[PDB]
Amino acid sequence: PGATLCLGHHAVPNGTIVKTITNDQIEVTNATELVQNSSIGEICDSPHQILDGENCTLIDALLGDPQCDGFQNKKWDLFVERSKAYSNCYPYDVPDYASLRSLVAS
Amino acid sequence: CNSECITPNGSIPNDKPFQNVNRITYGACPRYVKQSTLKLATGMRNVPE
Amino acid sequence: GIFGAIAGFIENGWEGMVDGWYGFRHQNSEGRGQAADLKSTQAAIDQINGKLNRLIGKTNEKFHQIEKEFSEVEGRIQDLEKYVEDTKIDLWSYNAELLVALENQHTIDLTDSEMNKLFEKTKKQLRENAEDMGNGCFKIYHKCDNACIGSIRNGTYDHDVYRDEALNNRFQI
Amino acid sequence: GIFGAIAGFIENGWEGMVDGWYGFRHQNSEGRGQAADLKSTQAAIDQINGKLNRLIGKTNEKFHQIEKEFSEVEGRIQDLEKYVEDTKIDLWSYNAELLVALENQHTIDLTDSEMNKLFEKTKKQLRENAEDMGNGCFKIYHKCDNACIGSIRNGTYDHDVYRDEALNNRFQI
Amino acid sequence: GIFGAIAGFIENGWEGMVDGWYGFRHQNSEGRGQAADLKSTQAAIDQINGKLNRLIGKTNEKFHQIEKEFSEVEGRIQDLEKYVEDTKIDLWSYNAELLVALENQHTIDLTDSEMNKLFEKTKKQLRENAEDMGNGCFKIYHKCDNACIGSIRNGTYDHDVYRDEALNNRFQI
Ligand SMILES: *[C@@H]1O[C@H](CO)[C@@H](O[C@@H]2O[C@H](CO)[C@@H](O[C@@H]3O[C@H](CO)[C@@H](O)[C@H](O)[C@@H]3O)[C@H](O)[C@H]2NC(C)=O)[C@H](O)[C@H]1NC(C)=O
Ligand SMILES: *[C@@H]1O[C@H](CO)[C@@H](O[C@@H]2O[C@H](CO)[C@@H](O)[C@H](O)[C@H]2NC(C)=O)[C@H](O)[C@H]1NC(C)=O
Ligand SMILES: *[C@@H]1O[C@H](CO)[C@@H](O[C@@H]2O[C@H](CO)[C@@H](O)[C@H](O)[C@H]2NC(C)=O)[C@H](O)[C@H]1NC(C)=O
Ligand SMILES: *[C@@H]1O[C@H](CO)[C@@H](O)[C@H](O)[C@H]1NC(C)=O
Numbered sequence: 082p083g084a085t086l087c088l089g090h091h092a093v094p095n096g097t098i099v100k101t102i103t104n105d106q107i108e109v110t111n112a113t114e115l116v117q118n119s120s121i122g123e124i125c126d127s128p129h130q131i132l133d134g135e136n137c138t139l140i141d142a143l144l145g146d147p148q149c150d151g152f153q154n155k156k157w158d159l160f161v162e163r164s165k166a167y168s169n170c171y172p173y174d175v176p177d178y179a180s181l182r183s184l185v186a187s
Numbered sequence: 188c189n190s191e192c193i194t195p196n197g198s199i200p201n202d203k204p205f206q207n208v209n210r211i212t213y214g215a216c217p218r219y220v221k222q223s224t225l226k227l228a229t230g231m232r233n234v235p236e
Numbered sequence: 237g238i239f240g241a242i243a244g245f246i247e248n249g250w251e252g253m254v255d256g257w258y259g260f261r262h263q264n265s266e267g268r269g270q271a272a273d274l275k276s277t278q279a280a281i282d283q284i285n286g287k288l289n290r291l292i293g294k295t296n297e298k299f300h301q302i303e304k305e306f307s308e309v310e311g312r313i314q315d316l317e318k319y320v321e322d323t324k325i326d327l328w329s330y331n332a333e334l335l336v337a338l339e340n341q342h343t344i345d346l347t348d349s350e351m352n353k354l355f356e357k358t359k360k361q362l363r364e365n366a367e368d369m370g371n372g373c374f375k376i377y378h379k380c381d382n383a384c385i386g387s388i389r390n391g392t393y394d395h396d397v398y399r400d401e402a403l404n405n406r407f408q409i
Numbered sequence: 410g411i412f413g414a415i416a417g418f419i420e421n422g423w424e425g426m427v428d429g430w431y432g433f434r435h436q437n438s439e440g441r442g443q444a445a446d447l448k449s450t451q452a453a454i455d456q457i458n459g460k461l462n463r464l465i466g467k468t469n470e471k472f473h474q475i476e477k478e479f480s481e482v483e484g485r486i487q488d489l490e491k492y493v494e495d496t497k498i499d500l501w502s503y504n505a506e507l508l509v510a511l512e513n514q515h516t517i518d519l520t521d522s523e524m525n526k527l528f529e530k531t532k533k534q535l536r537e538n539a540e541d542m543g544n545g546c547f548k549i550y551h552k553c554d555n556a557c558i559g560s561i562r563n564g565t566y567d568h569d570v571y572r573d574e575a576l577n578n579r580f581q582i
Numbered sequence: 583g584i585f586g587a588i589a590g591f592i593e594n595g596w597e598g599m600v601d602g603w604y605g606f607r608h609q610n611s612e613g614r615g616q617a618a619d620l621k622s623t624q625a626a627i628d629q630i631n632g633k634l635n636r637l638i639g640k641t642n643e644k645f646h647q648i649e650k651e652f653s654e655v656e657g658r659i660q661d662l663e664k665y666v667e668d669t670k671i672d673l674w675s676y677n678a679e680l681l682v683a684l685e686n687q688h689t690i691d692l693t694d695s696e697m698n699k700l701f702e703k704t705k706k707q708l709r710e711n712a713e714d715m716g717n718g719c720f721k722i723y724h725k726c727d728n729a730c731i732g733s734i735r736n737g738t739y740d741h742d743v744y745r746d747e748a749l750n751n752r753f754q755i
């Protein structure tokens with residue numbers, strides 16, 4: 082008579098393939114995604130202070146284009162510029178526009 | 188809503204170490220990589236019946 | 237893979253063992269049964285959770301940086317900003333590729349390791365009272381009911397109790 | 410190195426084995442002979458080709474970049490271009506050195522592993538019919554002709570056939 | 583951790599062993615004693631020193647670079663210099679963290695490996711003259727004085743000398 086005793090390990094019917102050092106496709110019992118591949122499509126207003134530029138570039142809010150009067154003296158952690166923004170004051174340019182914009186943003 | 192990480196596509200959860208949503212980011216964000224997926228094993232090799 | 241138990245001398249896993257990662261199946265005079273081993277399972281899980289702890293929820297805060305999209309052609313200064321960005325992205329992309337491949341080899345191997353240890357601990361427990369049949373199972377050369385079986389699993393099996401009995405059976409003619 | 414077979418209890422390799430990486434040498438009443446084991450050799454080869462597959466023929470395309478050589482002293486802007494490139498070069502150079510050291514460590518060990526597995530598999534097959542002489546060889550305690558030896562290599566050896574014979578020889582006085 | 587000797591079937595280390603990393607404690611008819619094993623100890627040290635040789639005193643010379651602190655707000659160019667530097671710092675900081683975690687895992691594991699190899703070599707030497715008690719110790723089933731004990735340690739133990747004696751003891755009723 083006597084007995085038999087077997088050692089073993091689990092398995093699943095729905096394993097997932099990952100890559101390793103010696104084989105690009107090996108099936109394991111479970112895995113997790115390390116790359117975030119999607120957004121919810123909106124910028125959350127918390128916990129950082131968001132300032133929506135709407136029709137105004139940073140430079141335009143700075144200079145004081147009338148439609149940007151609401152922006153006076155406001156602060157932000159992140160200023161958001163919209164592609165729809167436009168100037169509606171006296172036509173202007175800024176030598177090294179990008180730097181001024183940058184230093185103000187910061 | 189409340190989210191640490193902002194990108195031009197919108198805010199994203201920041202649980203994962205990497206992301207391929209946008210190279211532009213602000214806040215506590217995963218680092219941008221080119222891969223659309225990287226699967227980390229969290230179990231042993233599967234050897235079915 | 238590297239220890240050669242999982243996907244090795246263990247022909248395959250047991251899909252019906254859903255309450256642990258490693259365990260025992262037995263056959264004796266009262267029947268055949270299965271029980272997960274908690275300690276080995278936990279050992280494997282702990283190492284994997286350790287990896288996750290380094291990786292999950294550990295992102296770095298960055299704030300004002302450089303611009304990364306450009307609406308006008310500018311030349312020298314813009315090439316460098318773009319080149320800086322592509323270079324960074326490629327290096328980060330490398331570490332990640334390297335990290336996962338490496339983690340995964342080590343994870344398959346460490347889990348293989350724990351199975352083997354359990355095999356080894358069990359093998360040692362039975363002394364001269366059992367023989368290795370070569371596929372992860374042991375033939376026990378004595379009557380061994382559930383209490384007996386439970387004792388092996390429970391790490392309280394006393395080899396001395398069955399030795400005379402077992403030896404007579406092993407070394408018969 | 411890490412399993413302790415290759416450069417370990419196996420004193421050395423066999424230069425005369427040219428049709429496989431692992432194999433068997435035997436001596437018996439009909440003579441002494443050699444045969445490669447195909448499956449273990451292939452297992453090792455398969456793992457190494459996998460590394461090569463990640464590394465060989467997998468280069469990245471790059472096009473317009475920044476300039477990297479300069480005929481005039483320019484200062485601030487030029488310092489940065491050079492520094493960007495040196496920084497990049499140093500990091501890629503680091504990953505490669507580390508990569509090779511790591512890959513090489515894992516390959517010797519995985520190959521050591523495969524040798525050990527074949528030993529272990531062999532050890533189990535022979536059951537109580539052979540003893541480990543400690544240097545990777547087994548003393549087989551029964552008459553074992555070419556067909557017998559072939560059966561072990563072929564994984565069809567029946568320990569039950571020889572057990573009585575072997576036990577008498579092992580446990581003589 | 584991965585071989586399962588240290589912090590495994592070896593319950594703990596021996597603090598009173600100050601002349602080696604691995605060794606033997608014995609008990610026999612004349613008393614009980616301890617001696618370090620030189621070869622295994624040296625093997626572990628050599629591998630760790632090898633790591634040290636790659637890492638210590640191997641710094642890279644750098645000379646004129648870019649400025650990294652700034653007293654005036656300047657915008658675009660300053661943003662790029664700082665970001666390049668921040669980017670560089672993060673990747674090097676990453677490699678080091680990964681390097682240390684990796685080196686440390688492999689070091690615990692390689693040391694575990696050396697202990698196990700020493701166990702196995704010892705296990706094999708005693709042949710059928712000893713049994714594995716499961717906690718890294720062997721019960722030797724024959725009279726074995728210091729010279730006998732010394733022979734195992736010295737790798738000169740002749741198993742044939744003690745076999746009849748040992749076998750009678752193992753397989754008593
Ligand atoms: C296969 O493995 C994955 C990963 O091990 C399992 O995912 C687990 O799912 C839960 C629920 O989403 C995770 O909980 C979350 O943890 C994070 C950080 O630890 C926390 O911020 C969240 O609030 C949430 O509680 C959990 O992390 C995760 N497991 C681990 C240890 O990472 C998944 O369940 C497995 N799949 C199957 C079918 O077995
Ligand atoms: C930003 O300016 C745009 C463009 O002038 C505004 O769009 C107008 O919105 C009104 C009210 O709905 C419409 O009647 C007009 O047809 C729109 N004009 C154009 C040219 O599209 C918009 O209202 C402004 N946005 C904000 C939030 O102030
Ligand atoms: C996040 O936004 C970026 C930028 O808009 C998206 O990138 C675009 O992807 C499409 C689809 O292939 C391309 O045709 C465009 O050329 C990309 N635009 C730019 C300016 O790069 C990206 O798809 C978005 N990410 C996610 C995950 O939705
Ligand atoms: C181990 O032995 C003790 C003492 O009999 C018993 O109470 C316990 O249930 C056993 N453990 C398991 C889980 O079998």
Ligand SMILES: *[C@@H]1O[C@H](CO)[C@@H](O)[C@H](O)[C@H]1NC(C)=O
Binds near residue numbers: 565
């Ligand atoms: C293994 O042995 C079986 C049984 O005789 C035989 O059919 C087969 O040809 C053998 N395999 C090899 C490759 O020698």
Ligand SMILES: *[C@@H]1O[C@H](CO)[C@@H](O)[C@H](O)[C@H]1NC(C)=O
Binds near residue numbers: 733736738
């Ligand atoms: C090993 O044993 C031999 C035989 O007695 C002895 O002469 C020698 O001193 C030992 N060698 C070492 C290095 O301990």
